[PDB]
Amino acid sequence: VDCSEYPKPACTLEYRPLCGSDNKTYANKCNFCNAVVESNGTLTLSHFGKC
Secondary structure, X not given: OOOOOOOOOOOOOOOOOEEEOOOOEEOOHHHXXXXXXXXXXXXXXXXXXXX
């Protein structure tokens, strides 16, 4: 997914779960992309929905 507009200082509460390569279910794309940046690009997206 496109994380180009990240990191963002806040994420909304809109619950659109997606499963990281870490097996964490991120709450939405904002939370996921912020984690991608924090990971220095090690975290990828496995799939949409819960892990």
